[PDB]
UniProtKB/Swiss-Prot annotation, chain A:
<comment type="subunit">
    <text>Complex I is composed of 45 different subunits. Interacts with CARD15, but not with CARD4. Interacts with STAT3, but not with STAT1, STAT2 and STAT5A. Interacts with OLFM4.</text>
</comment>
<comment type="function">
    <text>Accessory subunit of the mitochondrial membrane respiratory chain NADH dehydrogenase (Complex I), that is believed not to be involved in catalysis. Complex I functions in the transfer of electrons from NADH to the respiratory chain. The immediate electron acceptor for the enzyme is believed to be ubiquinone. Involved in the interferon/all-trans-retinoic acid (IFN/RA) induced cell death. This apoptotic activity is inhibited by interaction with viral IRF1. Prevents the transactivation of STAT3 target genes.</text>
</comment>
<protein>
    <recommendedName>
        <fullName>NADH dehydrogenase [ubiquinone] 1 alpha subcomplex subunit 13</fullName>
    </recommendedName>
</protein>
<comment type="similarity">
    <text>Belongs to the complex I NDUFA13 subunit family.</text>
</comment>
<feature type="transmembrane region" description="Helical">
    <location>
        <begin position="27"/>
        <end position="46"/>
    </location>
</feature>
Curated annotation (Swiss-Prot), chain B:
<feature type="binding site">
    <location>
        <position position="28"/>
    </location>
    <ligand>
        <name>[4Fe-4S] cluster</name>
    </ligand>
</feature>
<comment type="subunit">
    <text>Core subunit of respiratory chain NADH dehydrogenase (Complex I) which is composed of 45 different subunits. Component of the iron-sulfur (IP) fragment of the enzyme. Interacts with NDUFAF3. Interacts with NDUFAF7. Interacts with CERS2.</text>
</comment>
<comment type="function">
    <text>Core subunit of the mitochondrial membrane respiratory chain NADH dehydrogenase (Complex I) which catalyzes electron transfer from NADH through the respiratory chain, using ubiquinone as an electron acceptor. Essential for the catalytic activity and assembly of complex I. Redox-sensitive, critical component of the oxygen-sensing pathway in the pulmonary vasculature which plays a key role in acute pulmonary oxygen-sensing and hypoxic pulmonary vasoconstriction. Plays an important role in carotid body sensing of hypoxia.</text>
</comment>
<feature type="binding site">
    <location>
        <position position="22"/>
    </location>
    <ligand>
        <name>[4Fe-4S] cluster</name>
    </ligand>
</feature>
<protein>
    <recommendedName>
        <fullName>NADH dehydrogenase [ubiquinone] iron-sulfur protein 2, mitochondrial</fullName>
    </recommendedName>
</protein>
<comment type="similarity">
    <text>Belongs to the complex I 49 kDa subunit family.</text>
</comment>
<feature type="binding site">
    <location>
        <position position="43"/>
    </location>
    <ligand>
        <name>[4Fe-4S] cluster</name>
    </ligand>
</feature>
Amino acid sequence: XXXXXXXXXXXXXXXXXXXXXXXXXXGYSMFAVGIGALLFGYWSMMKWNRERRRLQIEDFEARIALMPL
Amino acid sequence: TQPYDVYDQVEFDVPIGSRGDCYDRYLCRVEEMRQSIRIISQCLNKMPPGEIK
């Protein structure tokens, strides 16, 4: 018997198929997070600015209180 | 159109674009690569055992 190269089929590798698929973000869903992060962003930032006003008047008060300076 | 060594029997896919721009001239080569394994797989399945020379 003579032995040569043998053939293999099984699944035939599956040639030409789109492996690319959309993931995580769809379109409308990411905009709700996007503007949602903005709405949370400005609201939390301005609370510290109002807290800065408590310091702002009190810091400049030191110059008014000190006249022997 | 013009077979060389056992052609037309093997299923070939030819990518052809729309515009003559560099992007479509790039896409066809990538689409040639995705539609190249089909020829290789058909060559693996269809092998007559015999002579080399």
